[PDB]
Structure 1
Amino acid sequence: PPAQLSVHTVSWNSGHERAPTNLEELLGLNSGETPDVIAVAVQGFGFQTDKPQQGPACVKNVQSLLTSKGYTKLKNTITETMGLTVYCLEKHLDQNTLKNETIIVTVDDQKKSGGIVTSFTIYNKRFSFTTSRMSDEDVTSTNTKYAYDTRLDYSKKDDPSDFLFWIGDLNVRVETNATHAKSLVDQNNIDGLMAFDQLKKAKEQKLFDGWTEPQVTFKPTYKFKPNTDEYDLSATPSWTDRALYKSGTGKTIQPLSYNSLTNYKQTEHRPVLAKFRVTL
């Protein structure tokens, strides 16, 4: 049993955009790293029905690339608005302790808002990965617009997971006007602008309680003119895709890297890649 494992996560609010065919940068593999687990989350429109017939490319191109490196797909789950896939190096899996389970939670009668949780055990430690999606206009268990529900939080279980990650657009925004936000971006005052970000507000309301974000040094990932590095100032520049971590059992989780991937410019949000090292 190793002392430590590495975890890469990436999430993208990708909308109606197809998967890119260049996936190595997106998963954080392009400097030759071989992380122990990889989780990929999206938010957008149409995945499950898959009118665009994109599914096979996603499968063919990912299943392609990760299999050489010795990964196994534990689970892919899709809905009409969300997607979550988790992979683990084959070498770590004991099939009769793994207890591979996924739930889906739905908050509205159209099943457009809610979340997904995929959990599994290796070396007698339990991992849980969550993504979630909320609209600004819905009525919720929380009476907020933030993409939190206690049913997706495996730290609020009688038996909480050892390592927990929550990845996606949490519907947390920057609560100031665009002029001021754009001024702070141009000054590279990232912490100054973070002062207006809604995650702390969500936590004051006991949402995402005890969940930690790695330090943010990148500029807002939204809202861009597609194919440029130019903000569309019709919205206040915000941090949309986020990675949060927690342990339910006093285990150390150390972020290594937390970055937006500006080379993926196809849409209005830029994907966010986090790398962690966990101590079992």
Structure 2
Amino acid sequence: PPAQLSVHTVSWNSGHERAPTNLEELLGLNSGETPDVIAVAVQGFGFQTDKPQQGPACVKNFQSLLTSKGYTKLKNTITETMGLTVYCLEKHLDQNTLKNETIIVTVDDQKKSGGIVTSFTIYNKRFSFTTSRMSDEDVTSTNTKYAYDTRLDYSKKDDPSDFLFWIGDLNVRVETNATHAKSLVDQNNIDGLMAFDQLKKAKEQKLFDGWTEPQVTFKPTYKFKPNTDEYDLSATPSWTDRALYKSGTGKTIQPLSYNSLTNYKQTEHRPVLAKFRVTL
């Protein structure tokens, strides 16, 4: 059983947009890396019903690229507003010990907000992947708009997972006006603008407790005029898709990279790719 493993995560608030064509870039495979685990999270509208009938393409295209690479799909879970998919190199799996499990948490009577958690064990180490979705107007267990619920947090289990990732649009925004935010973006003062981001506020309120975000060096990933690099300044530019990590058991999780994928411009938000190396 190996000393270390690699994990790629991508999330995208993709809205009504269909999965793209070039998936290699999306999953961070385009420079020949072969991560041990890949998780893909989306937030948007109408995945479950699938009225555009786009389900069949995703499967076809994702399964085509990933199977030839040695990946097994551990689980795809979709709701009306969220999607989470977890892949693992076939070579790591032992059916007797994997304990592959997913819960869905739902906070409203329309089941539009909440989250999804997918967990599995390899080499007697337990991974958990969460995505979540909250609306600004929602009444909530935290009485905030942030997409946290303690049920989705497997570091607050009696037996906390070894490696935990939370990916998606956490409904955390930049709390200042658009003029000032756009000035900071133009100056490339990413840390200056992050000073106004709400993740720290969420944490002062004991949400995402002990969860770390890798250092952010990219400009806000929202809100863009589609197919441009131009901010739509009807909203204050913000970091919407995020990746957070923790360990419940003192295991080292080292971010290698954390980047928006500005090549994917087809919508208002840009997908975010994180790569980690975890020590078992």
**TM value normalised by structure 1:** 1.00
Post-superposition offset of 1:57: 0.3
Deviation of 1:271 (Å):
0.2
Deviation for aligned residue 1:106: 0.3
Offset at residue 189 of structure 1 (A):
0.2
Deviation at 1:170, TM superposition (A): 0.1
Displacement of 1:17 after TM fit? 0.2
Q: How far did residue 232 of structure 1 move?
A: 0.3
1:127 to partner: Cα distance: 0.2
Q: CA offset at residue 75 of structure 1?
A: 0.1
Shift of 1:18: 0.3
Moved over 2 A (4+): none
Q: Distance in 2 between matches of 1:67 and 1:101?
A: 21
1: CA distance between counterparts of 2:93 and 2:278?
17
How big is the shift at 1:48? 0.4
- Give the deviation of 1:96 after TM superposition: 0.5
> Deviation per CA, 1:20-59, whole angstroms, max 9, x where unpaired?
0110000000000000000000000000000000001000
User: Any unmatched runs of 5+ in structure 2?
Assistant: none
Query: CA offset at residue 233 of structure 1?
Result: 0.3
Per-residue CA distance 1:223-249 (angstroms, 9 max, x = gap): 000000000000000000000000000
The match for 2:74 is: 74
Q: Count residues with an aligned counterpart.
A: 280
Q: What is the alpha-carbon root mean square deviation over aligned residues?
A: 0.2
For residues 67 and 139 of structure 1, the distance between their equivalents in structure 2, rounded to whole angstroms, comes to 42
Shift in Å, 1:111:
0.2
Residue 217 of structure 1 is matched in structure 2 by 217
Residues 130-181 of structure 1, C-alpha deviations (whole Å, 9 max, x = no match): 0000000010000000000000000000000000000000000000000000
Q: Deviations over 1:77-116 (max 9, x none)?
A: 0000000000000000010000000000000000000000
**What does residue 170 of structure 1 align with?**
170
- Aligned partners of 1:68, 1:15: CA distance in 2, in Å? 29
Q: Which runs of 5+ in 1 are unaligned?
A: none
Residue 126 (structure 1) shift: 0.2
Indicate the residue corresponding to 2:259 in structure 1: 259
Whole-Å separation in 1 of the counterparts to 2:41 and 2:166: 10
Quick one: percent identity of the two aligned structures? 100
1:29 equivalent in alignment to 2:19? no
Q: CA deviation at 1:61?
A: 0.3
Q: Which residue of 2 aligns with 1:50?
A: 50
Distance 1:67 1:224 in 2: 34
Q: CA deviation at 1:273?
A: 0.1
